[PDB]
Design a protein around this nucleic acid. Structure first.
Lengths: 143, 67, 55, 144, 101, 138, 102, 72
RNA sequence: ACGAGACUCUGGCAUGCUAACUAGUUACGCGACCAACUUCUUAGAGGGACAAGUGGCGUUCAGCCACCCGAGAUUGAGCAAUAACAGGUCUGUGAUGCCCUUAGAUGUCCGGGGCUGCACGCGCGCUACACUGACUGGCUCAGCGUGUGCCUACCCUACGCCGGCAGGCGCGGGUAACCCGUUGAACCCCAUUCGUGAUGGGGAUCGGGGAUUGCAAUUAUUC
């Protein structure tokens, strides 16, 4: 129950720059496509256990997860695990990275504005696009 | 509160005045005799009448009561 | 003519297809157990039907 | 003089039965086991790997309640709140393609099979075999 | 089969129990084996309605009740005996159903 | 020739089939203290060690234990052990041993013979529940 | 794990840390002082116990020593007769303040 | 605002804090977590390693407070 | 003499009673040494609680307080007095008294704008703060109830196409303690966990997988 790995005051995974204060392996909110049941499934598929010591966990497991997500369509694993699926401009789910790029693509609002639709303005003003009622309840969104 | 109304009070008074022979001091025996010698249309009211009959029997075993 | 108009697209949930069997009123209908009375007519006839107040 | 398979507390009983069923060595789980959510009330996927073995033994007991065993009654053990956002709750279950794949892996095991009228039924010969195995692991190296 | 069932249903218990006792006594007058009266859980019909005909006043509701009591007695006898025991000038309200099953 | 009042409380139950035989005590349908919820094992440990083996050396017990709810079937196991012991000693040996050992068991605690009569009460008139009322405006 | 007797502290902090007087309201108005009273010890000791429920919670609530592990201090809060507590000395500060009215 | 403690495993510094647990009157994961201000899971791992060494016996398990004792 | 009480319904209790082939079972029982006169569920002619016993307060009255014993010791509701009000209802009723408009009858016809806005003019509503909140799916859980032709064309539901289950189609059961169902995409729990609180802990919108099939839903249906 010993490991010769050395504590690293600086660690780098995906070029993010965020406050490293707490533990790891489920504060991966900086990592976009790992965590919860899918990461549990991958780790169980890798046949690893929890007989080590928590607190000091390295990042190789999540690197392997992203490596398998580089070619996820080969093994026919249930393919509802990527973020934006069945989008226009491609019949597949390609790779992207870096922050400042994903949050925008969570709302692919170029073609829906180009079509001269109410949807572009519904999305743009920070208001409802499906119709959340906004006069007595439903006041969250700008505070 | 547990104040007995005129119904149970008057029924107990009449039962004691008319069948003082049979009534005793026990609630169970007073209950049985009250059921026998009177047509009490409810069992709760019968039990209340028997309880007040027992209370008044204790009262009159210690002297005369005016009712 | 008549068949060119009638029975084209089914009205599967007609509120106007139901009425109180006593006064032929649209509203307050009691369809449970097949009463098919409005609530006022039911209150008038509740004792005769067999429904009585206990609780 | 005749041992019942529901004789020990079912935790270690199903644990040992699953140990036997995995020690047979002829059956390896397919690739549609854990990535299925089954029901909503969970947060994670099957991780034990003996989930198939438990499904079959539990299903047997389900008959020790009634014929034509099916999954919804089996999964009604834990009900209460299931807050699902903007719509009320449901009553637990799993998936039927999972059941079909477990059946495809279950043929040749004489454990649990369908019937002609709808539902499941018990395999008495395999029943006796597993009873004998459980009894003779209990009475040889568990209570001496 | 000679298994015949009689199902007794009424909204009140006094008359239903009177009819049940009458039929049990009748089947015991003759030397007949009779399965004792079996009581269904007496399903209760509820209709809750606003008391007002308009929509005015304190929201007050009527809680109407209708309880249906069901008993079934099992005995083995041909149809003529059942037909004879039915014609007893029955009291109103107790619906009698006989099935040869 | 049918002496059974079994063991119940709240929602659960346990059919106390008590009969003369070899005399070994069958409890929980499972080994003594490994119950999977684990919450209330120690209450079962009071009487079985208090009384002794010889008192229960002839009691062959066969109980069908059912019912969800810890406070129901737990403490109903103790109600059943007390009541089955009472009936066994009464119908088989005498009343004096019955009163002695039963007095010991039911003087350890009272709550055996009495369950909570508390039940959920009706949703009342013009309110979300039994006593709460909808908010009144002026 | 103890083997010895924890009885000393187990009794000797809480179960006579207890205060000796609480207060009550005066007349019909005036929220500036409180008339000192007492109770047969149970109500005042267990009012200290209730404020200690709040105090031990806040010693756990958003704090380091958590619930299901304060067994030593809880046995202290339970057993019998001497004085070391904290919310009880809060109650004793209030005790003296309201007791200046005798 | 988590504190900074020496967690590195060295030829020297590693064997200077692992033989300090039995130097206290009260030695539990709770006491170590409230006093020495390092994860209680580290103390649980330490007692697990002690159990592996063969000087105690494990009884039951929990996510916070485990039972390891001895009868010799 | 009404009203109050009594009363009716409803809960809470039977080593008791009446009996059930839909719950429940005994050494001339198998599928296993390597037709119990009925009690858990159901429901009936009954029983049980009376301030009844004791102690203390009370022109030693009515009664009050406490305590054994007890399943239970002011115990859910329903019903509820003349005079009342210009309270609401003529839009529930060929229940009902007439001053009195209009043809744009307050009839029909999957037909058809709003009201599903956002500087709020108001009212009823939709929501828990940490090892307690939620996942391991690793042990038998709840109902209260509903469910298919006078009208009538509209009922509740038990396997597979299979992406990961309601489910677009074949399939049986149930006019129901017989089927749904010992209530079929639910406990609150838990080897995904918080070491002292913005993290794993409880969701600001809002995008894809096949959509229960309701012309429309967006100008209210659908993981």
């Amino acid at each position: 129950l010993v490991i010769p790995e050395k504590f690293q005051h600086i660690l780098r995974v995906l070029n993010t720059n965020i406050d490293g204060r707490r533990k790891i392996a489920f504060a991966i909110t900086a990592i976009k496509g790992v965590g919860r049941r899918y990461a549990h499934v991958v780790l169980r598929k890798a046949d690893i256990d929890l007989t080590k010591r928590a607190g000091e966990l390295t990042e190789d497991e999540v690197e392997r997860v992203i490596t398998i997500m580089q070619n996820p369509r080969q093994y026919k694993i249930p393919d509802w695990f990527l973020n934006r699926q069945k989008d226009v401009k491609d019949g597949k789910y390609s790779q992207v990275l870096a922050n400042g790029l994903d949050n925008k693509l969570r709302e692919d609002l170029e073609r829906l504005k180009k079509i001269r639709a109410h949807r572009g303005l519904r999305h743009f003003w920070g208001l409802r696009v499906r119709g959340q009622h906004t006069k007595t309840t439903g006041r969250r969104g700008r505070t | 509160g547990r104040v007995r109304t005129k119904t149970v009070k008057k029924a107990a008074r009449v039962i004691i005045e008319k069948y003082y022979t049979r009534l005793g001091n026990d609630f169970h025996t007073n209950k049985r005799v009250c059921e026998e010698i009177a047509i009490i249309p409810s069992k709760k009211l019968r039990n209340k009448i028997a309880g007040y009959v027992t209370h008044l029997m204790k009262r009159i075993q210690r002297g005369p009561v005016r009712g | 003519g008549h068949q060119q108009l009638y029975w084209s697209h089914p009205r599967k949930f007609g509120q106007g297809s139901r009425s109180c069997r006593v006064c032929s009123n649209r509203h307050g209908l009691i369809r449970k157990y097949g009463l098919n009375m409005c609530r006022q007519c039911f209150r008038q006839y509740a004792k005769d039907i067999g429904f009585i107040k206990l609780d | 003089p005749g041992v019942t398979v529901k004789d020990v507390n079912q935790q270690e009983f199903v644990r040992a039965l699953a140990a036997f069923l995995k020690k047979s060595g002829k059956l390896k789980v397919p690739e549609w086991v854990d990535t299925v959510k089954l029901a909503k009330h969970k947060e994670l996927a099957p991780y034990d790997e003996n989930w198939f073995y438990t499904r079959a033994a539990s299903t047997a007991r389900h008959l020790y309640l009634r014929g034509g065993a099916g999954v919804g009654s089996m999964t009604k053990i834990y009900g209460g709140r299931q807050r699902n956002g903007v719509m009320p709750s449901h009553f637990s279950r799993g998936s039927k393609s999972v059941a079909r794949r477990v059946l495809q892996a279950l043929e040749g095991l004489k454990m649990v099979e369908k019937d002609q009228d709808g539902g499941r039924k018990l395999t008495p010969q395999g029943q006796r075999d597993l009873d004998r195995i459980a009894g003779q692991v209990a009475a040889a190296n568990k209570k001496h | 089969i000679h298994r015949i069932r009689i199902t007794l249903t009424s909204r009140n218990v006094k008359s239903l129990e009177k009819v049940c006792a009458d039929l049990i006594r009748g089947a015991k007058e003759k030397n007949l084996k009779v399965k004792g009266p079996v009581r269904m859980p007496t399903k209760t019909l509820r209709i809750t309605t606003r008391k007002t005909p308009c929509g005015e006043g304190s929201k007050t509701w009527d809680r109407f009740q209708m309880r249906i009591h069901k008993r079934l007695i099992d005995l083995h006898s041909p149809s003529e005996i059942v037909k004879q025991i039915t014609s007893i000038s029955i009291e109103p309200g107790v619906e009698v159903e006989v099935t040869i099953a | 020739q049918s002496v059974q009042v079994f063991g119940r409380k709240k929602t659960a139950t346990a059919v106390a089939h008590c009969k003369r035989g070899n005399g070994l005590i069958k409890v929980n349908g499972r080994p003594l203290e490994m119950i999977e919820p684990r919450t209330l094992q120690y209450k079962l440990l009071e009487p079985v060690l208090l009384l002794g083996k010889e008192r229960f050396a002839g009691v062959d017990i066969r109980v069908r234990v059912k019912g969800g709810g810890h406070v129901a079937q737990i403490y109903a196991i103790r109600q059943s052990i007390s009541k089955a012991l009472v009936a066994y000693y009464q119908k088989y040996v005498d009343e004096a041993s019955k009163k002695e050992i039963k007095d010991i068991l039911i003087q350890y605690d009272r709550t055996l013979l009495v369950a909570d009569p508390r039940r959920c009460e009706s949703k009342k008139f013009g309110g979300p529940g039994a006593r709460a009322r909808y908010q009144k405006s002026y | 794990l103890t083997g010895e007797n924890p009885l000393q502290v187990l009794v000797n902090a809480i179960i006579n840390s207890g205060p000796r007087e609480d207060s009550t309201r005066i007349g019909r108005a005036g929220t500036v002082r409180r008339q000192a009273v007492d109770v047969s010890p149970l109500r005042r000791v267990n009012q200290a116990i209730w404020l200690l429920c709040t105090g031990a919670r806040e010693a756990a609530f958003r704090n380091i020593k958590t619930i299901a592990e304060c067994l030593a201090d809880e046995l202290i809060n339970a057993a019998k007769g001497s004085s070391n507590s904290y919310a009880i000395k809060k109650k004793d500060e209030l005790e003296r303040v309201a007791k200046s009215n005798r | 605002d988590k504190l900074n403690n020496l967690v590195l495993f060295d030829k020297a510094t590693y064997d200077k804090l692992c033989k300090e647990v039995p130097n206290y009157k009260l030695i539990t994961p709770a006491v170590v977590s409230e006093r020495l201000k390092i994860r209680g899971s580290l103390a649980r791992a330490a007692l697990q390693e002690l159990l592996s060494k063969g000087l105690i016996k494990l009884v039951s398990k929990h996510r916070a407070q485990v039972i390891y004792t001895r009868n010799t």
